[PDB]
Amino acid sequence: ANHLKFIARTVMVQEGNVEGAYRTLNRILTMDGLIEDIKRRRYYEKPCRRRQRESYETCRRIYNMEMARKINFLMRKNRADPWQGC
Amino acid sequence: SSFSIYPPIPGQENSLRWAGKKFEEIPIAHIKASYNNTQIQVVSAAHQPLAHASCGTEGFRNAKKGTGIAAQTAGIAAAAKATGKGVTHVRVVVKGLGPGRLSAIKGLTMGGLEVISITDNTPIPHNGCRPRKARRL
Amino acid sequence: PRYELALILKAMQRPETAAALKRTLEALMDRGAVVRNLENLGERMLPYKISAHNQRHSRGGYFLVDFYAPATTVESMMEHLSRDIDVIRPNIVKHPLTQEVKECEGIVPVPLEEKLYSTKKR
Amino acid sequence: QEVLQLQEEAKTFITRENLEARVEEALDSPKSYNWAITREGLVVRPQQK
Amino acid sequence: QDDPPPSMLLLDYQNVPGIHKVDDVVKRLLSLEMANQKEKLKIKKMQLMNKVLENP
Amino acid sequence: SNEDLPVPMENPYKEPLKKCILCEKHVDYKNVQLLSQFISPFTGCIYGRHITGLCGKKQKEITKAIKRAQILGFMPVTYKDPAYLKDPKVCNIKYRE
Amino acid sequence: VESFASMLRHSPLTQMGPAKNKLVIGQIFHIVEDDLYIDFGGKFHCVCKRPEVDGEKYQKGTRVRLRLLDLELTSRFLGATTDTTILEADAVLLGLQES
RNA sequence: AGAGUUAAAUUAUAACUAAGCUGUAAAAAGCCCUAGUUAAAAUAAAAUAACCCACGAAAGUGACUCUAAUAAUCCUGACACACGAUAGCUAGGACCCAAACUGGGAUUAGAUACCCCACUAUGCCUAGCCCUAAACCCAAAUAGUUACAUAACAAAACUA
Ligand SMILES: [Mg+2]
Ligand SMILES: [Mg+2]
Ligand SMILES: [Mg+2]
Ligand SMILES: [Mg+2]
Ligand SMILES: [Mg+2]
Ligand SMILES: [Mg+2]
Ligand SMILES: [Mg+2]
Ligand SMILES: [Mg+2]
Ligand SMILES: [Mg+2]
Ligand SMILES: [Mg+2]
Ligand SMILES: [Mg+2]
Ligand SMILES: [Mg+2]
Ligand SMILES: [Mg+2]
Ligand SMILES: [Mg+2]
Ligand SMILES: [Mg+2]
Ligand SMILES: [Mg+2]
Ligand SMILES: [Mg+2]
Ligand SMILES: [Zn+2]
Asked: Which residues carry this modification: N-acetylalanine (chain A) (predicted)?
């Protein structure tokens, strides 16, 4: 309101197509996390529900990043085995 | 062909024109996209309202106006009324997240109007007013 | 220095700007501040429109006053600079040169934690 | 060491006589705290513009 | 209720030599006027242990 | 009598601990550029540790210095200040794919 | 008769020190069509990819050069009592025995 | 614990445009002193930072600044003393928004429920009470050990 207009959350189209700039804008809001913020601020969530959701999200993030680390560690063993029928 | 995403600053000496006018001279398309309705208004650069349309004005009714096809027809009709008043380019701003966002933008595209910039101005409170309670108690 | 005054003034010309700075520093010296120096950051367009003294401003000058002041007179300084109308925003902070930079010695790598669960067979 | 440092810092303090000259000097000499940092950890100053 | 003077010249800056030849500005800065409450607490604590204590 | 046994000394090959970007540096609320490098250009949000990559001390000092500059009126809230848009990118977030 | 501490003191692996950024010559003992199994002689074989240049002269018994990073790739994941060895080594190809 | 301040929203109220706006799986009721855009006090709450794990004894605390400040040369210990989330009570003030109760509209054989609309106590401040919680991390405090050893599950077993 008090700020200057049309600087924030603004992308410009290239060569006359708007759908690509729209997916660009949606990626900006997605990495900034604003999309889930608008989904979660449609209704009110109690602080107990907020704490449970943050604990669940932290647990899932820890498990997923550690599992992806294990996949990236074991990716070099996906080659064909040299000792078949030994 | 170095293209920048960021807008041409009014205080800067950047030289980009669309049909002879500067960047802040181009009219504005406010797109309020709610979960049940989509209201479209094109206004001038001096914030004088050029034309207005909505899904209820396009002959749709209550559950029919929440879908995207009503927002698409609203974008086509609003771009037709904007072309009737004689505007070529418009800077479009979207308020709120709804199912008719894509449909409103492409309706404004297909209705005989050109867009150059899209700004998402969605009301994000910094923990301000308390919203309503959740469903399914 | 001990305190630092982030002082955003109204955008105006040289003589009444210098006069407003004059009465601001005599207001500080009346409460008893020992001012070290004055700093100008120039005049800039504000980040946002600020409503103060029944007016909306967009441009303003940025000034810094650093001083040694007793702890009881900071409220009197803030009250006088709130009633002053040629200033748009006064704020008083502790000066960052009072604290000394504690050492970033590097990022200690944290081990992954052991022994969280029992040695039962699943 | 601190009282000898405060001895020489008191010479440049603003007094009643010094106030006019210091206001006139400060309104003529702007200075900025702005600097940038790089990925390698080096400080870039915008004073070269 | 003991009353420290405003010109008390707080605890950390008492025993260094050459104070009274230094002008009023630095003495005012090093006095209790611009000091914190904890400096005054140290001053009261030092005076009270020198008042009542046997071996300080 | 065996001089070939190892000695109980510490590790000589300890490569020193990796440092943050502002490490043995001084942060401030008066410099808008340094505070605004760690801020999203389109929205004004403050990046976390996984994007910024600091010691926790400096991450907290950057957060407090930004928020002090946000309240005191030195830097914009809703957007990055466009005069400092073309600063070098220290953050590891990639917006264009 | 030499004691074993004396042999550890004069072993080349003790002279190696760090396993990071060490130039070690190795010998290829098994050929998989894109995968070279190279025994550089420390503990484990490493597995490299066949380069696009001179790829015909990498055969069995061929000596190559390596830059070691980890002598044994081994990590800890949460909920594990013991670490997870991959039973391999990590090294990349520079060239083959420039003489 | 005091004192001072407000960025994102939101609103009283004005100016242009439109005949519709809100509401859901779908509808009705309600509002058309309505809806959109531009200007904006007061009150309430403090996105991102936070993939952080700090402060406090616990409850609890994460918008900014300043002031005062976080006992014990540090063992256990009450029916004594001092605090104690939300909800509730007396008096004064404030009231954007949310909302028990209530009244309408849906659904149902019935619906004094789950769904929708409006509003009250209340949620806020000052002053005094009330002394209750799944006040739970269901794991008492202070010193220690990895010796013996798996009822089951869970957060491994244990000495003074
Ligand atoms: Mg406002
Ligand atoms: Mg309601
Ligand atoms: Mg329940
Ligand atoms: Mg209070
Ligand atoms: Mg009706
Ligand atoms: Mg009111
Ligand atoms: Mg906040
Ligand atoms: Mg203590
Ligand atoms: Mg006790
Ligand atoms: Mg209570
Ligand atoms: Mg109450
Ligand atoms: Mg009420
Ligand atoms: Mg009823
Ligand atoms: Mg609890
Ligand atoms: Mg119990
Ligand atoms: Mg006990
Ligand atoms: Mg069993
Ligand atoms: Zn650091």
From this structure: 1
